[PDB]
User: Fold Beta-lactamase from Escherichia coli.
Amino acid sequence: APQQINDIVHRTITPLIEQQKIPGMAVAVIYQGKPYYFTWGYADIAKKQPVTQQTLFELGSVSKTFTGVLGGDAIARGEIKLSDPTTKYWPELTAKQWNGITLLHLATYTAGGLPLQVPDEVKSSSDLLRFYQNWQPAWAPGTQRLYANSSIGLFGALAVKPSGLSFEQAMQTRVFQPLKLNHTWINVPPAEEKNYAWGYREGKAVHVSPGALDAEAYGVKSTIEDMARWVQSNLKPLDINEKTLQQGIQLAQSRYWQTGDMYQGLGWEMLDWPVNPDSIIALAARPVKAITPPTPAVRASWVHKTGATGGFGSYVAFIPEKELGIVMLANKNYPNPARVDAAWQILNALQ
Assistant:
């Protein structure tokens, strides 16, 4: 890499790894559109396997960016509309609280307090229906944001219904394959296990457990190379040949709601750039202001998403107007502020 990139990345990341006791980490910097890769430490401590550019990490909630884009693609295809009632795609959802809750609300965590987690006890399709039928909103739709797997997770599941495909099949065919993300998986195949890092939680090697709506909310695994390509694709959607996918990416970066300095997209979250680094809790309820109509993707944005599983911590941030971005994948779930601080140090130095 150019020495400037080499130096700021190493001088930022090495101390981070030391301070947070991160076993293994991969970083990609996208600079003037080109990717530069860095790796440290161990994918598997016990087996002494190093992190490489082919190592798979659990993205955790960074998966929601894929879900948002897949949903965007389904909108572009005319298969769904964000203004559609949820009940249009799940008629069995007959309980009265669902009147007025749209796909937009599900996608953007504004349905009225859907909970962060789908309970472990919810497994079958019948269990899932029961759960949503019994849920009692605390708030009217479109008034408060509460970040929630059960919200965007349901959005993802419903968004693919008209397609006839499973969520996984839709994601593969419509998102992963066209973008050549050939080492990105909802379910890691046996052939790829050699490259699947272990996560570390309290010193124990762990992988994400199966759960309802896992694929949709937190279940993607990917390499640093594929994630760099994901950032490139989101930085420059116009280079994407597939029309509805190009559109879907644009829709996911539209600004639907504002809370403080942040704007909610589909999966992605955005702030105006330049962004006060200080501007970038188990449950955090915030009133939202509707952006009527949503602002199309603003190039002068800090666009980002954090993600965690029990054993992994991921972060992606990019600035379209600067053709600049970063992916940080680690096999420990370390504090979000440390992720953002490191990303900002690096991108600020390069912009």
